[PDB]
Design an enzyme around this catalytic site. Structure first.
Site, PDB file in Angstrom:
ATOM      1  CD  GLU A 145      -3.178  -0.551   0.228  1.00 29.97           C
ATOM      2  OE1 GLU A 145      -3.146   0.581  -0.290  1.00 29.97           O
ATOM      3  OE2 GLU A 145      -4.072  -1.385  -0.031  1.00 29.97           O
ATOM      4  CG  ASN A 162      -8.496   7.204  -4.224  1.00 28.92           C
ATOM      5  OD1 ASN A 162      -8.709   7.361  -3.022  1.00 28.92           O
ATOM      6  ND2 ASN A 162      -7.597   6.346  -4.685  1.00 28.92           N
ATOM      7  CG  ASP A 180     -13.599   8.976  -4.854  1.00 27.91           C
ATOM      8  OD1 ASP A 180     -12.371   9.183  -4.781  1.00 27.91           O
ATOM      9  OD2 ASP A 180     -14.271   8.536  -3.900  1.00 27.91           O
ATOM     10  CB  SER A 204     -11.477  10.103  -1.737  1.00 27.26           C
ATOM     11  OG  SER A 204     -11.192   8.962  -2.524  1.00 27.26           O
ATOM     12  CG  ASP A 259      -6.344   5.879  -0.811  1.00 23.93           C
ATOM     13  OD1 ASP A 259      -7.476   6.125  -0.352  1.00 23.93           O
ATOM     14  OD2 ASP A 259      -6.162   5.148  -1.802  1.00 23.93           O
ATOM     15  CG  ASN A 307     -10.816   6.847   0.503  1.00 22.30           C
ATOM     16  OD1 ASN A 307     -11.931   7.317   0.692  1.00 22.30           O
ATOM     17  ND2 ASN A 307     -10.137   7.045  -0.617  1.00 22.30           N
TER      18      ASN A 307
END
Ligand code: CL
Ligand code: NA
EC number: 3.2.1.17
Length: 129
Positions: free
Chosen positions: A35, A46, A48, A50, A52, A59
């Site tokens: 990750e 991301n 959308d 958002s 991380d 998120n």
């Protein structure tokens, strides 16, 4: 901070992640590796809108507030920046909330595609725990 493999394993164990909700330590170390490559300062945007954050790429759509994710939740009640600290306490505590959500570690895409069903014990092999 960029953690060493065994250093992170030790830190996670001290924070109670070993066997938390049935997930052995190896699962958490494997997830962190893919990750964020063990980097607490990792961030990724991301599609959308958002973002991380941190070692476990939590998120902003549901878990933390970063002030730029419209109509999002702050379930862990913490600023997302707190997840980038060299001290992983915030990330660990929030991760515990996430994994107890009902979908287990499947919430982490990298874990599902690269750790799940593999010999995860190999990730803590040779470490003094
Ligand atoms: Cl589960
Ligand atoms: Na949010």
């Amino acid at each position: 901070k960029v953690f060493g493999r065994c250093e992170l394993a030790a830190a996670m164990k001290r924070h109670g992640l070993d066997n938390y909700r049935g997930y052995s330590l190896g699962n958490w170390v494997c997830a962190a590796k893919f990750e964020s490559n063990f980097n607490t300062q990792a961030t990724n945007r991301n599609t959308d809108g958002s973002t991380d954050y941190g070692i476990l790429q939590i998120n902003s759509r549901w878990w933390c507030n970063d002030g730029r994710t419209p109509g999002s939740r702050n379930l862990c009640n913490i600023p997302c920046s707190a997840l980038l600290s060299s001290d992983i306490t915030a990330s660990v505590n929030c991760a515990k909330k996430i994994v107890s959500d009902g979908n287990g570690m499947n919430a982490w895409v990298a874990w599902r595609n690269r750790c799940k069903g593999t010999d995860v014990q190999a990730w803590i092999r040779g470490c003094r725990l």
